Amino acid sequence: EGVDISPKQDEGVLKVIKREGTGTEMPMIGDRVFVHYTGWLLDGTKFDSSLDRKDKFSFDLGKGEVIKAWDIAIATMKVGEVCHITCKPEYAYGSAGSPPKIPPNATLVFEVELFEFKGEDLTEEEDGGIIRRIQTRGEGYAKPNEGAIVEVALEGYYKDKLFDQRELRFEIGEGENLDLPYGLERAIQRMEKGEHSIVYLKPSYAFGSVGKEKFQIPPNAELKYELHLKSFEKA
């Protein structure tokens, strides 16, 4: 019925906006998202919803945790948006389907409401110390380990102000000598080859209480780094 939002443009995913959202942004790849849904086969013989749960239905965008359609559809939504998505079998379950639930070559339709989306917490303890927003997915799945040699492009911001900008080759576990905050080294260890990302650092994972005098960074400071991972050697 509505706008074709399939990347290939084959009318595979159709979207009608039932209620307009708020704000300019949409979730990007790797972001965790929070929705409520109601879904049905085009014929309307089986029904499903997330509404029965106290908590929102949630997953990570782009990682293939849901039907291709959702990975596509949600990356077009805004906060508070309510929409209707029609999903041709190509972008859902295709030839075989998923017996017993979903019959062969079924088109699916969803009502989806996006409540919340947030970057990935990279900290082992999930304390919100390191948050990543992916700009460009990298090709690879391998990641650096402690002692690896990396080629990075990095740009540090304090209160939206650039203080550090370099293209360097260094060793994981030796960033301190090159004035790189600990959280950054830990963020790199989570990136893939060719990944462009924005990384948010709370003071604890930044320069902490000491600050960094030469970068005009006060003690106890939130840092935004925008960094690119070119290539690397594991050791």
Side-chain angles (χ1 to χ4, degrees), residues 1-45 47-53 55-233 235:
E1 161 66 57
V3 171
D4 186 19
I5 53 160
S6 61
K8 313 201 166 207
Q9 290 284 316
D10 55 31
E11 293 186 76
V13 177
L14 298 172
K15 185 193 158 187
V16 182
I17 287 173
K18 253 184 71 91
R19 201 184 70 231
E20 277 286 347
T22 65
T24 59
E25 270 155 20
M26 299 161 286
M28 46 208 76
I29 178 140
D31 282 340
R32 150 148 264 138
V33 303
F34 296 86
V35 289
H36 267 313
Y37 71 87
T38 306
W40 60 91
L41 319 159
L42 194 68
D43 53 57
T45 40
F47 278 105
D48 193 70
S49 170
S50 70
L51 291 179
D52 68 304
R53 329 154 53 167
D55 288 337
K56 268 89 195 181
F57 180 93
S58 95
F59 67 98
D60 288 6
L61 194 59
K63 286 269 167 72
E65 288 171 356
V66 288
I67 41 173
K68 190 70 210 210
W70 273 45
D71 268 344
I72 299 150
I74 279 84
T76 79
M77 297 194 70
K78 297 169 168 85
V79 184
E81 201 180 276
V82 174
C83 83
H84 267 222
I85 65 158
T86 311
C87 315
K88 307 266 190 306
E90 272 86 12
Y91 293 88
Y93 296 88
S95 304
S98 187
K101 277 277 206 169
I102 302 133
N105 300 300
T107 305
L108 308 197
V109 198
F110 297 85
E111 170 156 305
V112 170
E113 171 165 27
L114 174 75
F115 285 92
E116 167 187 357
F117 72 92
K118 48 178 200 159
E120 190 182 15
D121 191 334
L122 302 195
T123 58
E124 281 180 2
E125 280 213 317
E126 267 170 334
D127 59 16
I130 308 166
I131 306 292
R132 174 178 70 184
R133 310 293 302 269
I134 295 164
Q135 302 305 276
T136 335
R137 199 169 201 240
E139 54 176 3
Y141 268 131
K143 292 149 162 68
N145 54 328
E146 226 240 358
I149 307 288
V150 298
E151 278 215 340
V152 306
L154 61 93
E155 335 182 284
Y157 295 94
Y158 172 67
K159 299 210 146 196
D160 294 328
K161 194 211 159 177
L162 187 80
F163 62 81
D164 185 29
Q165 169 185 45
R166 289 173 281 164
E167 277 154 306
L168 51 121
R169 200 173 143 298
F170 72 102
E171 187 188 312
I172 297 295
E174 273 189 340
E176 220 200 308
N177 297 31
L178 273 27
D179 320 285
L180 309 182
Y182 179 66
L184 186 68
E185 282 183 79
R186 290 295 284 185
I188 279 139
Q189 294 187 261
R190 280 293 207 90
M191 305 180 67
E192 309 161 328
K193 191 192 200 179
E195 194 183 292
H196 294 89
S197 299
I198 307 170
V199 181
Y200 293 90
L201 304 178
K202 292 267 273 187
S204 338
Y205 296 86
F207 293 116
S209 47
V210 192
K212 191 76 198 185
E213 205 190 51
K214 77 164 174 192
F215 291 159
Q216 325 205 338
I217 303 176
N220 183 57
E222 250 170 46
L223 293 187
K224 182 179 90 181
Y225 268 99
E226 184 168 305
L227 84 155
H228 171 204
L229 176 56
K230 294 176 182 176
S231 54
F232 63 89
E233 323 288 278

